[PDB]
Design a binder for these strands. Structure first.
Ligand SMILES: [Mg+2]
Ligand SMILES: [Mg+2]
Ligand SMILES: [Mg+2]
Ligand SMILES: [Mg+2]
Ligand SMILES: [Mg+2]
Ligand SMILES: [Mg+2]
Ligand SMILES: [Mg+2]
Ligand SMILES: [Mg+2]
Ligand SMILES: [Mg+2]
Ligand SMILES: [Mg+2]
Ligand SMILES: [Mg+2]
Ligand SMILES: [Mg+2]
Ligand SMILES: [Zn+2]
Lengths: 81, 129, 215, 125, 222, 55, 25, 97
RNA sequence: GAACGAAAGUCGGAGGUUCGAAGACGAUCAGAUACCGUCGUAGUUCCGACCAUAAACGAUGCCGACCGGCGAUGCGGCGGCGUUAUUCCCAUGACCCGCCGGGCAGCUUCCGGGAAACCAAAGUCUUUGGGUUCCGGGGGGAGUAUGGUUGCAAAGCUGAAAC
């Protein structure tokens, strides 16, 4: 949120979930930020470069996160063909 | 039995948003519903939608975003004059900056913001935010 | 990818352990993991989407920075043997058996940790860490069957948790991929010992009987 | 009537947790060791604690005890396992399981070496 | 003049001076356990009021036993308030327990505008609601300089929350503070949970402080 | 361990009985408390020994 | 007193007052 | 409030169930509500079967079994010690061993 | 406005097994006309009419959509060199596996509601609007009195006020 002067007004911009596009609340302890790292070439060396998949509380409680991580990384191309 | 098909659409939209699904199956098709979803696309709350054209009556599949908090249909479709929209502003929209109201005007399906510039007014289908 | 593909020795190990067979009850989120039913109630779990979730679980475990931030839990005795020589091998911290609820919630007890990733064996036998995950904000990897709940679960690996050979093969090949990602073992190099440590040992009746027969 | 109190058992567990090398299988030695490593006012309490300490020593020296595990017991748990025979890690190169996984090995590209012919009726459950 | 007795690894990051603000903790929704962390982050958030100390009873074999249930509303005026409920056998013990639990259950408050983007926000971003028991509390945005039109207890709560201007609408047993104040707390806690049309873009996904300063935590844990 | 006093208070309603009992703290050195330890309180020592093994 | 027998005794009083009206029409 | 989801009996589809008389106190109770069991006894008590087996004409070629439909009602069945009370979580149970 | 409407009750015709309002006794009880027992009228049965009431209950209006899973049952349809029955291809029979349509249902669940019990409806309700019918505004007085109306009657429907 900005004003007419063009300043950054909001205190903190919360994490929008990568599954349901919902804002994770401050007291929402049932959320998680999954971390999966990138893979190198034919040698198969581990990278410090990683990617973050945010999963929120209702998705984690309903169990949609299991299919959600694979259907989110399928657009990346890192989980499957 | 079967009436207010825009409300029949938005109930499925509302339950899919509250469940957290990706896309919706909506069995009626009205040009009211098509222009309603066109306004929602133009304001960007929903995504791409495909109307499977059945021979009798098709089925609309809307790729959801996750943005829609609440959308519904005001039932009897009140006939609304200008200088009376502020009642619906204070009754429907959660704030001044946010939300939109769908005014069926005399020149087509329009918006609450579009109606004060077109200076037409008319009926109200519902609201979406 | 192109190097993370399964090989003929890998499918020999999987078909020798017999992890392709699963439970008799279905789940509504295990539908894309199963391929085809079979007579006498047994349902066949595939290998490709199992290997992909094993690969992503290995990626997530090597993605940690502190080895103390990964905790390994199993309550059943088929996994209690595997946990102690799994977590003390490469990169985790073990706990087995009676979980003592309050391990991660309250701080009056010295058995209190702050993990950043969790790998458990059976959800039905370890429902209590699945419950206590929400108060700690940790992800969860689980070796799920076709008849296991998927609440507070992020990565699910479809398998048979009843077969001790299957459990030991999964923990062994998981650590075998984790070590090759970390760089301890090269890609074209076999492991030094045959994984029975992670499988099982029947106690000293037939153990000492087979020892006296092998004298 | 040896159903001694939780304070007695907990004191003996603190003794076996802190000091393990000082303790043996002899009651007459362990009673004297406990009076150097702890302060017990009552002589009957000395005898009770030392008797349960000898019982814990006879349990620990014979087998594994869940109630406490020192670093030496962790090294013993490491020692108990590593003797691994080579009998049933992998079988001979003939394995027959299922026509469904035969179709899986036909679809997904792998060996599909041996033959598979097993037919069962529908008398499941 | 007492040692903090380092524990729970978040306070150990605070004492290693690595998380600069409590905003970074609310970005990641990390759980808090001890109460002095936000006293370290906030030196003027001690403005509090006990709302009601009501007695509750338990009918024992001969005489009824009493224990006092203390409600304490804490808050700094920048938009960070907390509510604490504690039942205890002693008055000051229940008051201290409710203060500590309010320090634990502090939340931030989102502040919005009425429709002009001048600066220094004063109101809720939209019409929000909160339910506890049967108590439905509705918070409506207000123009500049309107004030807080409510009961004195949530008037004091929203005065501590930095909301200078708001409209309220309560339905249910408003007479019970243990539901009415918690419904107001849920209504002011849903303010960040409301989906807003100015957070369309995918977030930056900044690194966790555990990943950023793992090594200090390792050398203080080992 | 316990100092116990039973006294009377004469008011206009009649007599009022007061019973004050105080458990004394353990003070092994001094005239403030008892020198004898409690029979239930089992006092163990800390781990004493340290480094320098063979050579 | 049951509501059933309250209703039946008021019913008996109603019958008595009806017979009183028939006695003095 | 409700104590049971079934409201005592098992009438869910229909609207009327025929009353069948009880055994102890002889009260007409609908059959889905009354305690309906089937007792299977030997015709002679087992301490007296051996006397008839010793003093029988045939060489153990007859063994009759007595089958009785037993039909109690729940007002006297608790006194008759069949349908003892249980807990709230214990009312969800099934056929006892 | 109208058709059915349990049981009991009323008016005719046939009998009368059992039970059995009232009634009569025999017992307990300080007191019993009641709970226990014996006899027994009306009734309980059928055929003609009236009465239109219940804890007539799922204490939950009807129609239509959406929002989890699982094991089952019953009724139709479909598939299964699966199994067993005739004499033998030809067709229905029975078991077993899965799916589809509406139904009586059960277990779990943070999908949500609600004060909770509990509920896949009692949800899609302050983020409040699918259509429509009937009723509630503290407890009593009272479903009472007075009117109108139906009924042979008992009574039924509508149904206030003072305090
Ligand atoms: Mg006195
Ligand atoms: Mg009665
Ligand atoms: Mg009751
Ligand atoms: Mg009925
Ligand atoms: Mg009748
Ligand atoms: Mg007559
Ligand atoms: Mg008789
Ligand atoms: Mg009488
Ligand atoms: Mg008569
Ligand atoms: Mg009625
Ligand atoms: Mg009706
Ligand atoms: Mg059928
Ligand atoms: Zn009976």
């Amino acid at each position: 949120m900005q004003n007419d002067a063009g300043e950054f007004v909001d205190l903190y911009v919360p994490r929008k979930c990568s599954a349901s596009n919902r804002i994770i609340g401050a007291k929402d302890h049932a959320s998680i930020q999954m971390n999966v790292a990138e893979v190198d070439k034919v040698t198969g060396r581990f990278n410090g470069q990683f990617k973050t998949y945010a999963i929120c509380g209702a998705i984690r409680r309903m169990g949609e996160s299991d299919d959600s991580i694979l259907r989110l990384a399928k657009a990346d191309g890192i989980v499957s063909k | 039995v079967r009436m207010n098909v825009l409300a029949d659409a938005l109930k499925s939209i509302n339950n899919a948003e509250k469940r957290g699904k990706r896309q919706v199956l909506i069995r009626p098709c009205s040009k009211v519903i098509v222009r309603f979803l066109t306004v929602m696309m133009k304001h960007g709350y929903i995504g791409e939608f495909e109307i499977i054209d059945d021979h009798r009556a098709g089925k609309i599949v809307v790729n959801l975003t996750g943005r829609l908090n609440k959308c519904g249909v005001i039932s009897p479709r009140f006939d609304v004059q200008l200088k009376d929209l502020e009642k619906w502003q204070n009754n429907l929209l959660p704030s001044r900056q946010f939300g939109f109201i769908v005014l069926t005007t005399s020149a087509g399906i329009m918006d609450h913001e579009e109606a004060r510039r077109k200076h037409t007014g008319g009926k109200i289908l519902g609201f979406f935010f | 990818l192109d190097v993370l593909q399964m090989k003929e020795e890998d499918v020999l190990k999987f078909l020798a352990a017999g992890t392709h067979l699963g439970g008799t009850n279905l789940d509504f989120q295990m539908e894309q993991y199963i391929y085809k039913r079979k007579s006498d109630g047994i349902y066949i779990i595939n290998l490709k989407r199992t290997w992909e979730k094993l690969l992503l679980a290995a990626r997530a475990i090597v993605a940690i920075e502190n080895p103390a931030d990964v905790s390994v839990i199993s309550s059943r005795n088929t996994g209690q043997r595997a946990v102690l020589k799994f977590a003390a091998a490469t990169g985790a911290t073990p706990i087995a058996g009676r979980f003592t609820p309050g391990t991660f919630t309250n701080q009056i007890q010295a058995a209190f940790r702050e993990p950043r990733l969790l790998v458990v064996t059976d959800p039905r036998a370890d429902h209590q860490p699945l419950t206590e995950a929400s108060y700690v904000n940790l992800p969860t990897i689980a070796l799920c069957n076709t008849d296991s709940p998927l609440r507070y679960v992020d990565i699910a690996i479809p398998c048979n948790n009843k077969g001790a050979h299957s459990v030991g093969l999964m923990w062994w090949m998981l650590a075998r991929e984790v070590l090759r990602m970390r760089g301890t073992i090269s890609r074209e190099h076999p492991w030094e010992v045959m994984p029975d440590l992670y499988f099982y040992r029947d106690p000293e009746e037939i153990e000492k009987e087979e020892q006296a027969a092998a004298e | 009537g040896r159903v001694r109190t939780k304070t007695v058992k907990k004191a003996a567990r603190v003794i076996i947790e802190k000091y393990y090398t000082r303790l043996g299988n002899d009651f007459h030695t362990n009673k004297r060791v406990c009076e150097e490593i702890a302060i017990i006012p009552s002589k009957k309490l000395r005898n009770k604690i030392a008797g349960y300490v000898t019982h814990l020593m006879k349990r620990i020296q014979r087998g594994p005890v869940r109630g406490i595990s020192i670093k030496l017991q962790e090294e013993e748990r490491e020692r108990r396992d590593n003797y691994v025979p080579e009998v049933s890690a992998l079988d001979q190169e003939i394995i027959e399981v299922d026509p469904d996984t035969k179709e899986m090995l036909k679809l997904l590209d792998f060996g599909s070496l041996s033959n598979l012919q097993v037919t069962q009726p529908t008398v499941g459950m | 003049d007492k040692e903090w007795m380092p524990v729970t690894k978040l306070g150990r990051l605070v004492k290693d001076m690595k998380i600069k603000s409590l905003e970074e903790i609310y970005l990641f929704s990390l759980p808090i356990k001890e109460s002095e962390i936000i006293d370290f982050f906030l030196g003027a958030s001690l403005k509090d009021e006990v709302l009601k100390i009501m007695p509750v009873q338990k009918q024992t074999r001969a005489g009824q036993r009493t224990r006092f249930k203390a409600f304490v509303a804490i808050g700094d005026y920048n938009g960070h308030v907390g509510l604490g409920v504690k039942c205890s056998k002693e008055v000051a013990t229940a008051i201290r327990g409710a203060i500590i639990l309010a320090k634990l259950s502090i939340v931030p408050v989102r502040r919005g505008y009425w429709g002009n983007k001048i600066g220094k926000p004063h109101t809720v971003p939209c019409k929000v609601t909160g339910r506890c028991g049967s108590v439905l509390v509705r918070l409506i945005p207000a123009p500049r300089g309107t004030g807080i039109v409510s009961a004195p207890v949530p008037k004091k709560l929203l005065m501590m929350a930095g909301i200078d201007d708001c409209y309220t609408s309560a339905r249910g047993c408003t007479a019970t503070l243990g539901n009415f104040a918690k419904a107001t707390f849920d209504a002011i806690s849903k303010t960040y949970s409301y989906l807003t049309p100015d957070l369309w873009k995918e977030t930056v996904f900044t690194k966790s402080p555990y990943q950023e300063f793992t090594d200090h935590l390792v050398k203080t844990h080992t | 361990y316990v100092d116990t006093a039973v006294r009377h208070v004469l008011l206009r309603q009649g007599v009022l009985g007061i019973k004050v009992k105080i458990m004394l703290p353990w003070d092994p050195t001094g005239k403030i408390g008892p020198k004898k330890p409690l029979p239930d309180h089992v006092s163990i020592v800390e781990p004493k020994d340290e480094i320098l093994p063979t050579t | 007193m049951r509501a059933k027998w309250r209703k039946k005794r008021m019913r008996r009083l109603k019958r008595k007052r009806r017979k009183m009206r028939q006695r003095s029409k | 409030t409700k104590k049971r989801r079934n409201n005592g009996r098992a009438k869910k589809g229909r609207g009327h169930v025929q009353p069948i008389r009880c055994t102890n106190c002889a009260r007409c109770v609908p059959k889905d509500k009354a305690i309906k069991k089937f007792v299977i006894r030997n015709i002679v008590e087992a301490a007296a079967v051996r006397d008839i087996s010793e003093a029988s004409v045939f060489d153990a070629y007859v063994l009759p079994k007595l089958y009785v439909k037993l039909h109690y009602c729940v007002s006297c069945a608790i006194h008759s010690k069949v349908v003892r009370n249980r807990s709230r979580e214990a009312r969800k149970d099934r056929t006892p061993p």
